[PDB]
Amino acid sequence: ETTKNVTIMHISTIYDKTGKATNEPALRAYDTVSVVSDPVTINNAKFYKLAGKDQYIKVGNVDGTSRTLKHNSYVYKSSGKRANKKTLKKGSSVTTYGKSFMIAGHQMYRIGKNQYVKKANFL
């Protein structure tokens, strides 16, 4: 196997070679793991194979998904405070990692370490 090191950006279920979830302990955000460098496709979904193991994680939890903003947006911390006073502008492409989180009552995507943007603001 040719492998590379990646940072988990979102809690990640461990799947088997058929894309079925296992009960193996989930990988946790900001841990580093060795994966086979090229993703695999299972059921038209992309996964990283963990190096040396028949275990697979979703690429969206590592490389993310590029999404376009339909509204000007603030960036929040998990506490609910604004992370900064910057505004991400409508039409910007922003990478989001995994499934949205509930932050201060709103569904939000993680865009960075302790940085979140409201899901409703994306196209």
Author numbering: 335 to 457
Published text:
S-layer proteins (SLPs) are self-assembling, crystalline proteins coating the cell surfaces of many prokaryotes. We determined the atomic resolution structures of all functional domains (I-III from N- to C-termini) present in the three S-layer proteins SlpA_ac, SlpX_ac, and SlpA_amy. The Lactobacillus S-layers are anchored to the cell wall through interaction with teichoic acids (TA), either lipoteichoic acid (LTA) or wall teichoic acid (WTA).
The crystal structures of the TAB domains (SlpA_ac_III, SlpA_amy_III, and SlpX_ac_III) reveal high structural similarities. The general structure of the TAB domain consists of two cell wall binding motifs (SlpA_motif) which are connected by a short linker and arranged as an internal homodimer. The main difference between the two binding regions is that both SlpA motifs contribute to the TAB1 located within the cleft of this domain. With NMR titration experiments, dissociation constants of 3.5 mM and 0.5 mM are determined for GroP trimer and GroP pentamer, respectively, indicating that longer GroP fragments increase binding strength. To obtain a molecular model of the SlpA_amy_III in complex with two GroP pentamers, we used a combination of molecular docking based on the NMR-derived chemical shift changes and classical molecular dynamics (MD) simulations. For both TAB1 and TAB2, reliable HADDOCK models were obtained and minimized in energy. Sequential analysis of TAB domains from different Lactobacillus strains (P38059, L. helveticus; A0A0PECX7L, L. gallinarum; Q09FM2 L. crispatus) reveals high conservation of residues located at the proposed TA-binding sites.
